[PDB]
Amino acid sequence: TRPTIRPRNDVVHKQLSAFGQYVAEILPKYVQQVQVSCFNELEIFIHPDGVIPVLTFLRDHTNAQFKSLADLTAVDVPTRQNRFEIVYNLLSLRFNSRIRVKTYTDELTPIESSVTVYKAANWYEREIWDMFGVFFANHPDLRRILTDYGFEGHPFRKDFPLSGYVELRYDDEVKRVVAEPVELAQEFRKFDLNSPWEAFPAYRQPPE
Amino acid sequence: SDAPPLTLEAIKDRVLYVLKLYDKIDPEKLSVNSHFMKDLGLDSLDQVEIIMAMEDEFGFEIPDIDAEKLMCPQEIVDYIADKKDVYE
Amino acid sequence: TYKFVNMREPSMDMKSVTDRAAQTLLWTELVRGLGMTLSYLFREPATINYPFEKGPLSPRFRGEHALRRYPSGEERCIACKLCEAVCPAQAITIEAEPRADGSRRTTRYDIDMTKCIYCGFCQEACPVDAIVEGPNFEFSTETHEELLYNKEKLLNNGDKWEAEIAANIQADYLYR
Amino acid sequence: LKKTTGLVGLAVCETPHERLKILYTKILDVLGQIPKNAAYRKYTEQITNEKLGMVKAEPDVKKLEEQLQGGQIEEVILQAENELSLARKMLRWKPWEPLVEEPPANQWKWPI
Amino acid sequence: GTSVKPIFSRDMNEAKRRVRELYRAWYREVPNTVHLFQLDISVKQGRDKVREMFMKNAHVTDPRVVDLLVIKGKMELEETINVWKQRTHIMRFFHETEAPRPTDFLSKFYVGHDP
Amino acid sequence: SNLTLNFGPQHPAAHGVLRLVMELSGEMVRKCDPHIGLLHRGTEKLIEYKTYLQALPYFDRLDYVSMMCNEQAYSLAVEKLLNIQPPPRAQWIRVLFGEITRLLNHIMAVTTHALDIGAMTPFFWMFEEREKMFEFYERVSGARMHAAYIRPGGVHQDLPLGLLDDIYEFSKNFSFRIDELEEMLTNNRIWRNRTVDIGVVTAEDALNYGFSGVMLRGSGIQWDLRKTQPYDVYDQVEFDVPIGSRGDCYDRYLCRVEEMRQSLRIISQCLNKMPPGEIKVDDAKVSPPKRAEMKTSMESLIHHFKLYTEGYQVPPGATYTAIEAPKGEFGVYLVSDGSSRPYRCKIKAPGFAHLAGLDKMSKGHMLADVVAIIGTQDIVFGEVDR
Numbered sequence A: 001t002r003p004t005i006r007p008r009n010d011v012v013h014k015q016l017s018a019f020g021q022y023v024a025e026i027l028p029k030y031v032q033q034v035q036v037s038c039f040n041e042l043e044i045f046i047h048p049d050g051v052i053p054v055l056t057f058l059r060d061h062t063n064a065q066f067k068s069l070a071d072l073t074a075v076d077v078p079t080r081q082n083r084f085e086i087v088y089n090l091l092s093l094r095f096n097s098r099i100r101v102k103t104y105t106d107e108l109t110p111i112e113s114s115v116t117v118y119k120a121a122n123w124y125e126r127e128i129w130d131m132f133g134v135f136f137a138n139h140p141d142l143r144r145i146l147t148d149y150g151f152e153g154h155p156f157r158k159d160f161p162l163s164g165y166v167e168l169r170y171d172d173e174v175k176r177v178v179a180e181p182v183e184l185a186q187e188f189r190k191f192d193l194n195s196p197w198e199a200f201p202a203y204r205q206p207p208e
Numbered sequence B: 001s002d003a004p005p006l007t008l009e010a011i012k013d014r015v016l017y018v019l020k021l022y023d024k025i026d027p028e029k030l031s032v033n034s035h036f037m038k039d040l041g042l043d044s045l046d047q048v049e050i051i052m053a054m055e056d057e058f059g060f061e062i063p064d065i066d067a068e069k070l071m072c073p074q075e076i077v078d079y080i081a082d083k084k085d086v087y088e
Numbered sequence C: 001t002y003k004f005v006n007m008r009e010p011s012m013d014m015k016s017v018t019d020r021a022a023q024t025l026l027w028t029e030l031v032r033g034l035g036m037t038l039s040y041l042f043r044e045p046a047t048i049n050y051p052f053e054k055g056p057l058s059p060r061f062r063g064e065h066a067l068r069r070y071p072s073g074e075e076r077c078i079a080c081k082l083c084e085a086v087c088p089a090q091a092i093t094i095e096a097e098p099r100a101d102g103s104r105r106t107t108r109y110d111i112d113m114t115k116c117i118y119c120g121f122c123q124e125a126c127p128v129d130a131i132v133e134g135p136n137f138e139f140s141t142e143t144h145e146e147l148l149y150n151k152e153k154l155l156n157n158g159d160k161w162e163a164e165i166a167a168n169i170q171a172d173y174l175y176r
Numbered sequence D: 001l002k003k004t005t006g007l008v009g010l011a012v013c014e015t016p017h018e019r020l021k022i023l024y025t026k027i028l029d030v031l032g033q034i035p036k037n038a039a040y041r042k043y044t045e046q047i048t049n050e051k052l053g054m055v056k057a058e059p060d061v062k063k064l065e066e067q068l069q070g071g072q073i074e075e076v077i078l079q080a081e082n083e084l085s086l087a088r089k090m091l092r093w094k095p096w097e098p099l100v101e102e103p104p105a106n107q108w109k110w111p112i
Numbered sequence E: 001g002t003s004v005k006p007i008f009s010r011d012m013n014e015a016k017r018r019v020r021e022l023y024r025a026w027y028r029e030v031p032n033t034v035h036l037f038q039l040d041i042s043v044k045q046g047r048d049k050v051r052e053m054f055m056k057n058a059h060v061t062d063p064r065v066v067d068l069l070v071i072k073g074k075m076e077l078e079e080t081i082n083v084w085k086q087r088t089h090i091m092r093f094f095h096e097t098e099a100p101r102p103t104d105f106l107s108k109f110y111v112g113h114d115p
Numbered sequence F: 001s002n003l004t005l006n007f008g009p010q011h012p013a014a015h016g017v018l019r020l021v022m023e024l025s026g027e028m029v030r031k032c033d034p035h036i037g038l039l040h041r042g043t044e045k046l047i048e049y050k051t052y053l054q055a056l057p058y059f060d061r062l063d064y065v066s067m068m069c070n071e072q073a074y075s076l077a078v079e080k081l082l083n084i085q086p087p088p089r090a091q092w093i094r095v096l097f098g099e100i101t102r103l104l105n106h107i108m109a110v111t112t113h114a115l116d117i118g119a120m121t122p123f124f125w126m127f128e129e130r131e132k133m134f135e136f137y138e139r140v141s142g143a144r145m146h147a148a149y150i151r152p153g154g155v156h157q158d159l160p161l162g163l164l165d166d167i168y169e170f171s172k173n174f175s176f177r178i179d180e181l182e183e184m185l186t187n188n189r190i191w192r193n194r195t196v197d198i199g200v201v202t203a204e205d206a207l208n209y210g211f212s213g214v215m216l217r218g219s220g221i222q223w224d225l226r227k228t229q230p231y232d233v234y235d236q237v238e239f240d241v242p243i244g245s246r247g248d249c250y251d252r253y254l255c256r257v258e259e260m261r262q263s264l265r266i267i268s269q270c271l272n273k274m275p276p277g278e279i280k281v282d283d284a285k286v287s288p289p290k291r292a293e294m295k296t297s298m299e300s301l302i303h304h305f306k307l308y309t310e311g312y313q314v315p316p317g318a319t320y321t322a323i324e325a326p327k328g329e330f331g332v333y334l335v336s337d338g339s340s341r342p343y344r345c346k347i348k349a350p351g352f353a354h355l356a357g358l359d360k361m362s363k364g365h366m367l368a369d370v371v372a373i374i375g376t377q378d379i380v381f382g383e384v385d386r
């Protein structure tokens, strides 16, 4: 168990558990769940309506002081009724800690823009909108950031195909670059790698 | 001197000229009281183009509201008369 | 544990003021920079006489791909397709069948050199040292089609570069 | 006395004790308008009272900075203003109310 | 019921009002677009294309979907006005190098296997 | 009307494919609108279709000036998710090559910044040193830049039998090259005029906008991830953290030069403290076995086959792992669903936030000052666009 196994830290685990309990007690209106991962990573699941309060409390509270937003992104899980999972990562320099705040939304429900709380979010929320199609309410200048001008659809969504729907080429008759339906000389070859034998008993799900 | 004392007859003549200048409307068929949607079979989008043509013709901004009701030429004449204060 | 890069205060004695005035009016630090460039003018340049002189390389160098043989002249590749499975760019295409003598050999072995990222994962994955990245790097073509390698081209590369490839492998296989 | 706080845009504070006392009194005044059983009120009152006692008991700025663990008393002042603003916001938000909505049964289930 | 939260409009009337406003803005923009991008189309062609793009989505009955469609159309209009777009992007709406794909059964049967 | 100008992508000062739409009154910059995405390759979706070993060479090509630092961040994320531990010699190799990579990145940043400003000479002096470090990269992995040496289990191969001596020979001459660079730039009144009080950012603004690395330290914020949240063997080396005073371009330049010196210090320590032992985790269900074992033992062959076809499975879970990359905090949000392919990989690049703040930092400045600010933010668009 010594040489090749990653060592544990129970002190940080206890501190993060206590602080998660602290946050949950202070904001019962929005906090739905609190988790401490095995490698000491605090996670706080909330209600979407509490995006702005929670973050504000987390960045302003004397005992919190998470004044820096590492990054903000989204995860697509099609099996969930609320497709998109919004993940905020925050860093506290005063207490040398990190915290993760997660909420959910679907295709037609906006999330409150948090540019007011953190200036850094601007481009992160633009990127989430571009890649996933999640609208952010009250956003200063919301528009595509990564994709091409006039590009239809959101690439990061699970349903979207890897190579998309159109390609580009230069056409001499019209003397310009044109977009046409994708044709591939060699199709991407899909591999089935998943082993039919279970790897991790600790994560086994009930047999329904 | 500035612009002449515009009258209702001038407004009606200009409005009907604009309508007869629209491709999707046969000229001699349209009347002053012909409803745009019912009489000429025009869609909501078509009405929007006609109102914008009025704004170009008479040079004043007709909001989205108060344009949703100008559904026959006569209502356009009444609206312009009200906005420009013309009675005779 | 930290240090300051711009927290120094200048002395205000008459000598220091006169030295700074001389620096301002007579441009001393500019002459210092001129002296540095003049010093570099009289050094030997670090340029090499290419193509006559070459840059140093290593036995681990990753270059053009090649298919190798056993000393008997039999091909090493047995069509396990591990290189095709591991390739992150999907640059390898393999088709195989039993040979006329029942041997497990490939009938198609293509590498798309304009897909390849030259990572060397395939030669790590190969269990019989059949596919290698040889030492060559001067194989620019005039057309795109010349960079779509089939089995004949790769076997020819192996035949052409075996003498150096074997010597490179002998010098590095004990680190692998 | 001290020059160069060292952080760009953070001016040196003359008379920081008075500023800290005023800010902490304002914070307690705002907390007085929150329901007494709300966790935010009691936690913030406790920490504010400790900080105010520390400020009142220590006339020396560097010793007070070492007691407060807040990093260069100008930053302590800034954090006090931040807490006051948050207190007003929390008064408006009322996050001590019961959870607004319960999420779907499989919403946070992972994997899949 | 159905417990949904709006984006901008509470019913289809407000959504239609926003659609009409965006249509007015595109209609006004088309001649400037033809001038600035030096397009070889007429203003009539551009306005016809704008109408065709608007009518592609005429079947929508959800105010939230309509609000998102108006947001996307406003994004495209802002993009066109500021010249972020190039002539190739504007001309991508007309599919000038795409051979017409037939729709009747017999031609589809002749060309290949796809329906 | 303000003049509207396209700055890039085909511009020398652009530092890549950047379309900076700028509103100007005369030469004064009224507004900066960075348009990015001209190097968006869709890396994260591609990473979703790969195994964990197949996704590693993408992190080489995120920030193409700090390859091994990108590899180390990803490897740390995957090792944290696997609950395994790299061996000590591998960690020392990782820290040594991370400091060499920091030297590479800082040389590139400082010399390209000087080249934009107009001082073209130091670039040629420092790129010979960059060439020698590329040679170090090549000897260890066979590649000059995209090495792919650092793997989620340690490193791919052990150092060749004479590499430490050559790294020592290079490291004992580099300080004089830094000195020549500083003679060229540090006290030049023209350079100070082009750099002092340009692009000044306050500590509060730097924190809120999401800045990291030098963009924080030039404004006096005392934060270095190697000191506060150490990884590998960074807790066993000694070095100082440069700190600025004014938050301008000049202070950021001094910080980077001193950072280069401190990296030399760390390299000297790593050379004198490299321990013996194996280079990857002695766990053949994660790290491939040696080839002699693969050709003699049944278990080793089975594990080689499975690790190179299907790859190792990672237990379900999500991590955010961050390192102090030479351009700032570099992070990975990695989501595993239990299989051998990552479910999600979000990449956090400091250049994203720095470029999002470029418009703020350029208020009240001219065209040349904006060029200097782009240079001082140390932007590579592979990591910005991904």
Ligand SMILES: CCCCCCCCCCCC(=O)SCCNC(=O)CCNC(=O)[C@H](O)C(C)(C)COP(=O)(O)O
Pocket (backbone or CB within 6 Å): B043, B044, B045, B046, E015, E016, E019, E026, E030, E033, E046, E049, E050, E053, E054, E055, E057, E058, E059, E060, E061, E066, E069, E070, E072, E073, E074, E076, E090, E093
């Ligand atoms: C230069 C050329 C380039 C072209 C530029 C690209 C333009 C893209 C703009 C896309 C934005 C949208 O689709 S916006 C979404 C539009 N869809 C809806 O509003 C759904 C309900 N349908 C209706 O209300 C009617 O069918 C209607 C026909 C709308 C009239 O309405 P009236 O009953 O009130 O006449």
Ligand code: SF4
Pocket (backbone or CB within 6 Å): C083, C086, C087, C088, C089, C090, C091, C092, C111, C115, C116, C117, C118, C119, C120, C121, C122, C123
């Ligand atoms: S070097 Fe890498 S990309 Fe090229 S064929 Fe081998 S595995 Fe594929």
Ligand code: SF4
Pocket (backbone or CB within 6 Å): C076, C077, C078, C079, C080, C081, C082, C083, C084, C094, C125, C126, C127, C128, C129, C130, C131
């Ligand atoms: S080259 Fe090697 S790995 Fe690839 S199919 Fe042949 S034997 Fe297998």
